[PDB]
Amino acid sequence: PQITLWQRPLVTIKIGGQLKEALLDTGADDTVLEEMSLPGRWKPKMIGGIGGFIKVRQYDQILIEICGHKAIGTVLVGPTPVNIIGRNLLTQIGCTLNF
Amino acid sequence: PQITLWQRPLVTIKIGGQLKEALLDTGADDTVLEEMSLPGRWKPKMIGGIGGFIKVRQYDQILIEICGHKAIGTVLVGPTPVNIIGRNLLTQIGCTLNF
Ligand SMILES: COC(=O)N[C@H](C(=O)NN(Cc1ccc(Br)cc1)C[C@@](O)(Cc1ccccc1)C(=O)N[C@H]1c2ccccc2C[C@H]1O)C(C)(C)C
Numbered sequence: 001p002q003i004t005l006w007q008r009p010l011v012t013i014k015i016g017g018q019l020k021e022a023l024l025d026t027g028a029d030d031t032v033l034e035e036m037s038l039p040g041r042w043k044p045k046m047i048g049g050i051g052g053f054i055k056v057r058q059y060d061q062i063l064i065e066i067c068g069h070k071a072i073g074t075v076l077v078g079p080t081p082v083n084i085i086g087r088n089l090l091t092q093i094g095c096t097l098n099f
Numbered sequence: 100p101q102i103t104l105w106q107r108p109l110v111t112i113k114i115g116g117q118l119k120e121a122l123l124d125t126g127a128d129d130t131v132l133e134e135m136s137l138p139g140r141w142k143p144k145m146i147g148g149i150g151g152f153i154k155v156r157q158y159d160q161i162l163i164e165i166c167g168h169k170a171i172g173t174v175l176v177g178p179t180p181v182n183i184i185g186r187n188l189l190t191q192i193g194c195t196l197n198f
Pocket of ligand 1: 008023025027028029030031032047048049050081082084086122124126127128129130131146147148149180181183185
């Protein structure tokens with residue numbers, strides 16, 4: 001699809017059999033979701049935001065649907081303002097910027 | 100132009116007669132630039148994201164030129180770790196997300 005930016009680019013994702021609202025963020029190198037439960041082991045990760053770096057859990061090879069596009073990648077879990085879908089997954093669904 | 104997301108979508112901008120590199124961020128409501136001088140009146144503002152909030156100065160009706168495209172809008176100046184072009188300006192240059 002083509003998404004304009006007059007409002008927040010919010011879309012429905014599906015992870016762990018559940019639906020959530022997430023923001024397509026080309027400015028985010030990674031994908032970080034609000035506190036939740038994911039399977040397997042996780043690793044430590046420091047992501048830097050507008051106000052500093054925070055601690056987050058890193059799970060790899062996680063299944064996640066974005067606007068019907070199935071993707072499998074790294075998903076970070078932590079205290080983010082909103083669910084953020086980053087470049088690591090935006091590149092998997094073939095998302096590009098255009099003007 | 101069409102910009103991919105394999106790498107951060109950084110572009111050149113011209114503001115206040117100065118050339119700068121900035122990050123096209125669809126996950127950004129506003130445009131915030133690193134410490135610099137801008138013309139006119141300003142009002143203090145607090146913006147937040149991963150890591151928390153930072154204090155910035157808000158200047159309105161500021162001219163900007165992104166990849167040759169002239170635009171007008173609000174610009175925030177403060178301790179941001181990277182120059183960021185927010186949705187408030189991306190819309191003016193006709194920028195959209197496609198996949
Ligand atoms: C209403 O408030 C706002 O619009 N604030 C904006 C904002 O903070 N944007 N979002 C966060 C956010 C998204 C949606 C909503 Br709803 C609210 C906040 C994040 C950001 O793109 C900015 C950023 C980019 C580069 C360096 C540092 C920070 C970011 O944090 N990027 C990092 C990131 C995120 C997840 C995983 C890894 C990494 C690494 C880096 O790419 C504003 C302050 C620019 C205006």
